[PDB]
From a paper:
[name] is composed of an N-terminal domain ([name]-N) that shows weak sequence homology to the cysteine-rich domain (CRD) superfamily, typically involved in small molecule-binding. The C-terminal domain of [name] is composed of a β-propeller and two EGF repeats ([name]-C). Our data suggest a multimodal mechanism, in which [name] can bind two specific sites on the SHH morphogen, alongside multiple GAG interactions, to inhibit SHH signalling.
We also determined the crystal structure of a [name]-C:[name] complex, which exhibits the equivalent anti-parallel, dimeric [name] arrangement bound to two [name] molecules coordinated at the same site compared to heparin. In summary, our [name]-C crystal structures in complex with GAG molecules identify two discrete GAG-binding sites on the surface of [name]-C, which are distinct and non-overlapping with the HhN-binding interface, thus suggesting that both GAG- and HhN-binding can occur simultaneously.
Author numbering: 213 to 307, 315 to 440, 445 to 457, 461 to 484, 490 to 570, 573 to 670
Write the structure that this text describes.
């Protein structure tokens, strides 16, 4: 047993952590998601900032029982967050049982370590009848589009035919183009989408037929895009390769051998031998590798063992709640135990055959800077699209929505100050300064 990997505790004191990811800005911050509705920052020196990066625990409806999937579900940073400060979160909230929101946020202009809560911009609201099979994973592909993985919500045919106003998004991989200059809608539909300009099915839907998906593995590489998801109907533990336009109802898995939390594609630097592997794990820490045959394109699973090497250990506390990836590509376990309140932990996966810092893995921290995009500076009245288009609130216009509109116009030298509000010169009265005193 010389081929094993091992697990290194990085931080503890977390409250039900569900995942972790970086923001791609060079700062090597790791953002840890906590189920009740928090996002904490872990610095590359290993400190957790006191102030959460994002606190939406009052907006978030979370569940005390473990099988209750309600809470904060996923987070994705825009590929160009370093310049536009855009991020996307999915979470459950109250309004029949609850609503699954996908919302855009922008980091604050003054503080690169805190989101501006005022910049919430709702993209989707998906009705939910039950508290399982939710999904919620947000991710960006090499194409630059935003993918959204939704489970079936345990919604039956009778539930949907009877109750109108159910979203029809449940059970689907949605693909959005968030880089729009259009102001009438929060996102535009990619033309590559299979139901683009098609009245029969929602244009957002990229694929469907998902039931209870885990965290899906996303490969970056060099042809197109590969997304592998675990799914368990309810036992029925299958793994699916996501392709455009496919219906995965009664679809076999890539594997017959053999519930899984999810998986990841290792693109880190610390392990050479693991580079490019698809890895999936269950809640108890049993891990497997998926290898595709270049010849047949069939998939095969092999076990991946953990073993102790010094303080890099072959075991960890509690159950795996989620996975993480840092800006260097290394991967993490998020686990929690019952016990006290904050018994959640962040662990790193380590290849003990290799140094912790091989020469080629060195990378200089570029500390996070405040936004400098022209839009964020000057877009006073309205919101900025991820492209930098300043979208005016009603009653405003100009390149950055600085000039208010007055219809009819202010008279006698009056100034249009706010929408349809005229500041009159002394001696002139009325809503447009039209009456002479
Ligand atoms: O089936 S699983 O192995 O994936 O387990 C997940 C289910 O755990 C439940 C019910 O499990 S059961 O009692 O064994 O039928 O939650 C409650 O029980 C488990 C028992 O764990 S065990 O390893 O499956 O035996 C508790 O976990 S444990 O800490 O005792 O290991 C649950 O706590 S938790 O899942 O760790 O958060 C316990 O709930 S509670 O935290 O004590 O309140 C179901 O989850 S629950 O209903 O949300 O509590 C899960 O099954 S479900 O069908 O998805 O509901
Ligand atoms: O321990 S549980 O079996 O309760 O697992 C927790 C989830 O089970 C529900 C519904 O899930 S399901 O039945 O698997 O589809 O509760 C259901 O199970 C118990 C039976 O207890 S038992 O010992 O596990 O058999 C019922 O309680 S009882 O009245 O039979 O004593 C539940 O009734 S109720 O839903 O609480 O009203 C029964 O629901 S049902 O027969 O399917 O309608 C869920 O409980 S609930 O949602 O709180 O009502 C649990 O899922 S949860 O949504 O995460 O809470
Ligand atoms: Ca999930």
């Amino acid at each position: 047993k010389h081929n094993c990997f091992c697990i290194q505790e990085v931080v503890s004191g977390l409250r039900q952590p569900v995942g972790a990811l970086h923001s791609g800005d060079g700062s090597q911050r790791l953002f840890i998601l906590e189920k009740e509705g928090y996002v904490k920052i872990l610095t590359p020196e290993g400190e957790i900032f006191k102030e959460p990066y994002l606190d939406i625990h009052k907006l978030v409806q979370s569940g005390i029982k473990g099988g209750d999937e309600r809470g904060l579900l996923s987070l994705a940073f825009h590929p160009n967050y370093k310049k536009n400060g855009k991020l996307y979160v999915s979470y459950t909230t109250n309004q029949h049982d609850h609503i699954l929101r996908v919302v855009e946020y922008t980091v604050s202009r003054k503080n690169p370590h805190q989101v501006d809560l005022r910049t919430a911009r709702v993209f989707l609201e998906v009705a939910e009848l039950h508290r399982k099979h939710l999904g919620g994973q947000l991710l960006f592909g090499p194409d630059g589009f935003l993918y959204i993985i939704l489970g079936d919500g345990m919604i039956t045919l009778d539930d949907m035919e009877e109750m109108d106003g159910l979203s029809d998004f449940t059970g689907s991989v949605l693909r959005l183009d968030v880089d729009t200059d259009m102001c009438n809608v929060p996102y535009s539909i990619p033309r590559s989408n299979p139901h683009f300009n098609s009245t029969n099915q929602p244009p957002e839907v990229f694929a469907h037929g998902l039931h209870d998906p885990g965290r899906c593995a996303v490969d970056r590489h060099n042809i197109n895009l590969t997304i592998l998801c675990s799914d368990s109907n309810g036992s029925s533990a299958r793994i699916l390769q996501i392709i455009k336009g496919k219906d995965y109802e009664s679809e076999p898995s890539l594997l017959e051998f053999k519930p899984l939390v999810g998986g990841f594609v290792y693109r880190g630097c610390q392990s050479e031998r693991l580079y490019g592997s698809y890895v999936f794990g269950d809640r108890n820490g049993n891990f497997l590798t998926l290898q595709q045959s270049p010849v047949t394109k069939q998939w095969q699973e092999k076990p991946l063992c953990l073993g102790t090497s010094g303080s890099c250990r072959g075991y960890f506390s509690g159950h795996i709640l989620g996975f993480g990836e840092d800006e260097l590509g290394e991967v993490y376990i998020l686990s929690s135990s019952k016990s006290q309140t904050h018994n959640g932990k962040l662990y790193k996966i380590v290849d003990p055959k290799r140094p912790l810092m091989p020469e080629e893995c060195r990378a200089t921290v570029q500390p996070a800077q405040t936004l400098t995009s022209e839009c964020s500076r000057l877009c006073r009245n309205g919101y900025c699209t991820p492209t930098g288009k300043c979208c005016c609130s009603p009653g405003w216009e100009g390149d950055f929505c600085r000039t208010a509109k007055c219809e009819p116009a202010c008279r006698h030298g009056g100034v249009c100050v706010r929408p349809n509000k005229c500041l009159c010169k002394k001696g002139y009265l009325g809503p447009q300064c039209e009456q002479v005193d």
